Subunit: 180 residues, 4 copies
């Protein structure tokens, strides 16, 4: 295939993220050289999840995303049987040891409301906290409890807008936005 978007992803995101995203796609029968926009979205979602877990204190967050499915669910079981929290029907992205709730992190190229709705009706599980970021700088969170302080969220939003500009400078943005 040899797309521009594939080479941009490997040059824009750090190698641990790119490697984790490649594994994730191949685990579900997808190819980063063909599904290159999905490749870019998964790297972005990964980097946001990691920046998020760095926003708290040392021990605050348990990272669920970026693990293989079986180990991710194993950590979820341990957390649930240790804290008595309901076992979510779907894999969340993090666990907040301070607020004692699982977090599902969303990154969308749409209006946060339109994504939150879809991400909440399908969420079904009432317990898990939801937190959406947008490539335009909007964010929406359950009960408007945004977990982290403003500074850590602001850095996530700045990084997201930088990724947008880099894609636009290479004319890859419009194809990326129109392929959600």
């Amino acid at each position: 295939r040899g797309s521009h978007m594939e080479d941009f992803v490997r040059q824009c995101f750090n190698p641990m993220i790119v490697e984790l995203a490649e594994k994730a796609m191949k685990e579900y029968g997808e190819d980063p050289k063909i599904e290159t926009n999905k490749f870019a979205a998964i790297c972005t979602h990964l980097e946001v999840c990691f920046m998020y877990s760095d926003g708290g204190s040392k021990h605050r967050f348990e990272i669920i995303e970026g693990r293989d499915r079986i180990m991710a669910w194993t950590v979820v079981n341990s957390i649930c049987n240790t804290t008595g929290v309901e076992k979510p029907k779907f894999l969340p992205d993090l666990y907040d040891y301070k607020e004692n709730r699982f977090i599902e992190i969303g990154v969308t190229r749409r209006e946060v409301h339109i994504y939150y709705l879809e991400k909440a009706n399908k969420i079904k599980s009432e317990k898990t906290h939801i937190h959406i970021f947008s490539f335009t700088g909007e964010e929406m969170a359950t009960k408007a409890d945004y977990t982290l302080d403003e500074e850590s969220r602001a850095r996530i939003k700045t990084r997201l807008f930088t990724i947008r500009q880099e894609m636009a400078s290479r004319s890859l943005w419009d194809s990326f936005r129109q392929s959600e």
Copy 2:
């Protein structure tokens, strides 16, 4: 011998822990290839002690476990003659510079009460603080003063339950539980 439990231990715990546990067993005339459940228990107890000492601040805890016997007692003497605390009759696991007391950490596959009792009657030394963790997520501590905040304890309990699941996924758990 070549047991499954031995290979699981080396693949589940990090090499510094495995090495420290091997030394500890050989110092007391035990073989990790034969006493493989004891091998697993010592690695677990070691990892819990290290996670515990990381839960406090930078200078809070002095680590006693994981040293050879003579150096461990040497540090105890220095702590005692520096803080005036009673020299314990038995080797503790940590010293809390903030609360000024030695800590004995227990990890059991039984009810925390049954282990605490045995670990307290044999403790004899009235001064040292006791803190028990279980593979099911229960904890018991002297005066119910659990030293660390909830988040740091919760991580220890999550790790303990992950070790349990990994053993069970390999059918090693029932032999591990029935060999205390």
Copy 3:
């Protein structure tokens, strides 16, 4: 050319700073072997900017100086469109996520008042915060809000006076002061 000041700069500042300063000069058609005092000033300004951003918390400051022009402006756009702050007419040195303002850092061998005035009339942009340091230990900041606590500023001033003494011990100071 082979000047003493060039060899002093490479021996006094750390290699990442020296390399960043060399790139910056060559990007604007200047040579560090000829414009050696400018070479020294840019390394100094760079080290001060980096020490400054280290004075805050983990996530407080976004570093703008030390990047190439296009990426520096890209980060500025992301910050502006994320926080709604006015896009400055000129490239600032940092962004404070806590106080939500861009910072322009000045390092002068003159009176802070004389430099602040020139650095403020040409600043034009009313929004960006200004913070001047001197090689004698004086500092001046917008509204006399010096952003960081005293200890972090004191370290910057101590380093600046050490650079002065080292230049004077090599008789390079008077040429450095008289070439602003």
Copy 4:
């Protein structure tokens, strides 16, 4: 010469400390293979100074000891001309940016009172703060303002008593104590 005390020093203290102590002795025309007790005392004083500066916050302390004489005085000049503090007649060990005073750290095998007196009458300079530690666990400080919190001081005292026991276990202590 090949003394036991020399081999104990190299095996007990870390290589950066041993190297810094060797330079310090040779700068003043002393040999670590002959003045082996002085060798041990300088390594001890160095390790205490470094542990002390680690007890505060990130930016709190400027380290003066362990530098060559000319650079140590250069940092002192910068600190003095930056904070307006009196230039001490003698080289101190640290500068506290939080309390804005130089610290002279003492490590003695005598009574802290007997050492403090001698270390204060010869200090002459009224401004610099004095802080003495003993190999028995006593400490004395100017105005009984001990700068650091109890935990950080307790660790210094524990290390000092460990060095004592190690020397005694090798029958080197009595020669060390009787050679102040």
